[PDB]
Design a binder for these strands. Structure first.
Ligand SMILES: Nc1ncnc2c1ncn2[C@@H]1O[C@H](COP(=O)(O)O)[C@@H](O)[C@H]1O
Ligand SMILES: Nc1ncnc2c1ncn2[C@@H]1O[C@H](COP(=O)(O)O)[C@@H](O)[C@H]1O
Ligand SMILES: N[C@@H](CCCC[NH3+])C(=O)O
Ligand SMILES: N[C@@H](CCCC[NH3+])C(=O)O
Ligand code: NA
Lengths: 506, 505
RNA sequence: GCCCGGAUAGCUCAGUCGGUAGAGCAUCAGACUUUUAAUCUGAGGGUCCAGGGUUCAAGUCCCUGUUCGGGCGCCA
């Protein structure tokens, strides 16, 4: 059964292990990386042989071309770079050792090559080995798939196979790590302090998002995973540390979409004695420097519908577009929206429903004032911001978790940074009034409470912290994955996730 | 009184809100930070008054000393920086505003001061206020004590109170951040790649512990919480990324005590084409650099229990002590230790049992050959590592994820760094053999079925990844919290944790 | 939670009505001392995701189920 490669390879390796041959050596002394080898010994003329120079390199064989019984060509691939290995028995230790070592090497094997650098007569950089050492054989078949692997299921289930075959995934992960490093550097230079808040809190709190209930055996009580570190950061700000940040993981037991994952990484910082107006400039510097540093140009090309789909050229020039959504929505709808003062009344709800019907906007059967307005915004506002765009104060009906506007009435102070019709940043001015916060929590607990349950959906511990006095601060949150998607021309969150969640094959 | 104080202050704040004035202004543009203010204006000689520059600063009042009715001294508190505000009626906006602003400010309230820097004849830096704005009143009565809340319970349950009354806690967190920041940069400049492995998996893997069980609604199934990212790191190394590292959280479903938490942070890295003796230098250099960069010197004084008991003086001199484990235990053990390199059968468990019983060592009912050996080593050879020390060449049955010793038999190519009689970081040589790994997993699963509870399962995907070929690598792990305790002179894991888990009571 | 799509030899794809399923890559054995998707000569291989049905007859026609790729919902 020649096709049954796994059984044959396993038998061969078992025979090697039995017959006094170790196919898993403990240590191989690598002297130079493949990248440095390519960068250094590139000036050689074709048909050169640096006999005096001897180095050691290691990598995975990706091809085994046999031009004869004494000349076999290998293709080491490591560090995302490739190096040919022209194996000539004349330059080997001995003919018998040459045959013995070439009878075991197959595609996908990991070897340690010790030989002189050189170039072939066709001007291809290679290394003429003096002793090939088998490091870790590959038992399963490695497919010679051109244009790389293109099956989503195998690419996401077997990430190692995707990294071995495809080469751009390594670039994607490298770019994500740089993004994280750049955010850390910027925030640390601004004077912020990195913190590690608990990820397993004690009570659900007032969060419409479904939590991840977890049972603690010793405590004999349920624990809920962290949805957002908002409360702990603000309790730290009360303590005296006026600038904190944390790039951690969030857990939301919700659905999975192209841009939504149950577990995701976000960066959240809180700075005292500031506001969202003071934060748009910081966000501008953040994003502009990120795009300029990770890439080489402020302009980024994005494909929201795959490589064959429509291409969009976003521009990250630092002066991002700022729009107040009330005026922009009025202009788009071409009508005078009710004054923000009446927004809590029923006639504004009625008239907004009239806009939804007239302008052909869909909405679920529940049609509260915040949600249909959010629908109008989705189809008449963000749908046009290919470039980064700041949306200014939003109606208080959206989210009352922000302070009242200084000049405008009934307008929460917030902004959302929209890129490619998707929000990446979101910052608020902070409510530091204990009474208003208590009323908000009470309302959230009443909404979240399934029955006559209270406190469980509130954070009295936090409500006590605000009673001690919190300075006027401003929060800020960015989705790391939602930015890595745009900076890597990725339209799916699973492409930037290292090991995406997959149901068992069974 | 605290209830009366809260009621009175709440009524006063409500009255203030009613009468137009808002005690919670939206914004206050602070011109200069308190530390920068102090550093810039400390050069002044006593007695001057720079009536030319107006600066706006903010902080929390810590004391309100009264000297008559025409002079009130405030005491702002910044990031461990104290500035004294002396409010003078003559230099204020007006007398009426002076009275109206001094009749509403109490201890603990957050205020914003705008005015001219100065210094009285005594010689302390002050800012003469032109107007004082109340930003956030403190309704509760802040405890005024000359020592700072000493009740660890309150210190832990209410960390904001601890930070307000105690500054050392703030620095403890600064050092912790420095430790993590240094480690990331050290691996970064070595060429490592930072990764974010999943926190929820089908089954736990990477270490041996009791996991947390959750439920997923979208994918209807039970998902266990992360115990160690080891397996995913090894799959990544199989993929082609030679060097990886990750500083993230791990979860254990064990009891909560003075030195254990449900959630903790660990640093794990994996580099290919190396071995456990290659990390012997990297780990030593990283620890020595951490100690020198954070403390400022290579010697650290640590109090194992309380700041008044014995104070052992450790020394992080880069040539760390290196000894073997089995051989040193043989030397330490009064009686002869069985060869046990090829001996791991009932006889070895029997001899370890009689040794354990004879040495008055008590071990959990399993008394596993491994559970016996680790207890014996930890009770006899473990307590000599005041200075950092490497303990290498462990027996095979202790760790099921380490390659067999190139020379020694039935011994794992692993070492442990022990400082202050505690484990801070250990590293093995990764076992890339798929058949041997599958056997080890099968024995682990058999033990779990028989009488074990926190042992691991079979991970078929990891076995397939090993079948695809894993280069010779060496992993390395480190508990951040233990090093934070050692470098900040803390005997409790609660001290180095911002909001440590406590019994609900 | 609701709809639209698939699954074929180790793997990348063909397969017309319902009248077995084919080709390349890869694998194995050979020849070739300058190849690079090396070339040439030989050899294997499957019930077509899993079940029921429908039929004289099913990869094809239909139902359910597993698991992926999408859309609307959820994430105030
Ligand atoms: N489920 C999710 N999947 C991916 N990114 C998310 C998810 N939820 C939130 N984000 C990102 O996190 C950012 C801040 O979210 P929030 O802190 O809830 O305002 C958003 O703007 C998104 O970029
Ligand atoms: N139950 C636990 N709670 C908190 N920290 C723990 C617990 N178990 C182990 N640790 C930490 O894990 C460290 C060892 O990590 P490592 O050397 O990577 O195995 C210890 O020094 C502790 O700080
Ligand atoms: N942490 C929030 C911002 C502050 C929340 C309360 N104003 C976020 O990331 O969206
Ligand atoms: N993190 C591992 C040890 C270090 C990494 C070895 N692969 C553990 O403690 O379980
Ligand atoms: Na052929």
């Amino acid at each position: 059964d020649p096709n049954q490669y796994y059984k044959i390879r396993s038998q061969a390796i078992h025979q090697l292990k039995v017959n006094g041959e170790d196919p898993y050596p403990h240590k191989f002394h690598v002297d130079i990386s493949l990248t440095d080898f390519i960068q250094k010994y590139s000036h050689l003329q074709p048909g050169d042989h640096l006999t005096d120079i001897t180095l050691k390199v290691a990598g995975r064989i990706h091809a085994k071309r046999a031009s004869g019984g004494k000349l076999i060509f290998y293709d080491l691939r490591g560090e995302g770079v490739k190096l040919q290995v022209m194996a000539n028995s004349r330059n080997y230790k001995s003919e018998e050792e040459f045959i013995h070592i070439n009878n075991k090497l197959r595609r996908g094997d990991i070897i340690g090559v010790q030989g002189n650098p050189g170039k072939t007569k066709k001007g291809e950089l290679s290394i003429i080995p003096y002793e090939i050492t088998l490091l870790s054989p590959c038992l399963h078949m490695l497919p010679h798939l051109h244009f790389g692997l293109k099956d989503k299921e195998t690419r996401y289930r077997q990430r190692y196979l995707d990294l071995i075959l495809n080469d751009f995934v390594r670039q994607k992960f490298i770019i994500r790590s740089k993004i994280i490093t750049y955010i850390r550097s910027f925030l640390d230079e601004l004077g912020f302090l990195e913190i590690e808040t608990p990820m397993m809190n004690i009570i659900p709190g007032g969060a419409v998002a479904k939590p991840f209930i977890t049972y603690h055996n010793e405590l004999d009580m349920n624990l809920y995973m962290r949805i957002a570190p908002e409360l702990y950061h603000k309790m730290l700000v009360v303590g005296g540390i006026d600038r904190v940040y944390e790039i951690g993981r969030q857990f939301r037991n919700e659905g999975i979409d192209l841009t939504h994952n149950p577990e995701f990484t976000t960066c959240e910082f809180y700075m005292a004695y500031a506001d969202y107006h003071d934060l748009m400039e910081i966000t501008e510097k953040m994003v502009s420097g990120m795009v300029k540093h990770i890439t080489g140009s402020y302009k980024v090309t994005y494909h929201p519908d795959g490589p064959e789909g429509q291409a969009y050229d976003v521009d990250f020039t630092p002066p991002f577009r700022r729009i107040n959504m009330v005026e922009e929505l009025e202009k788009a709808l071409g009508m005078k929206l009710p004054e923000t003062n009446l927004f809590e009344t029923e006639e504004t709800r009625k008239i907004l429903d009239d806009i939804c019907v007239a302008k052909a906007v869909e909405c679920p059967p529940p049609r509260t004032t915040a949600r249909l307005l959010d629908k109008l915004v989705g189809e008449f506002l963000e749908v046009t911001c290919i470039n980064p765009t700041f949306i200014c104060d939003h109606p208080q009906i959206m989210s009352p978790l922000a302070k009242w506007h200084r000049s405008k009435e009934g307008l929460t102070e917030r902004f959302e940074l929209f890129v490619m019709k998707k929000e990446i940043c979101n910052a608020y001015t902070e409510l530091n009034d204990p009474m208003r916060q208590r009323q908000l929590f009470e309302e959230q607990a009443k909404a979240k409470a399934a029955g006559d349950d209270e406190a469980m959906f509130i954070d009295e511990n936090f409500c006590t912290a605000l009673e001690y006095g919190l300075p006027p601060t401003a929060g800020w949150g960015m989705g790391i994955d939602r930015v890595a998607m745009f900076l890597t021309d990725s339209n799916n969150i699973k492409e930037v996730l290292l090991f995406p969640a997959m149901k068992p094959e069974d």
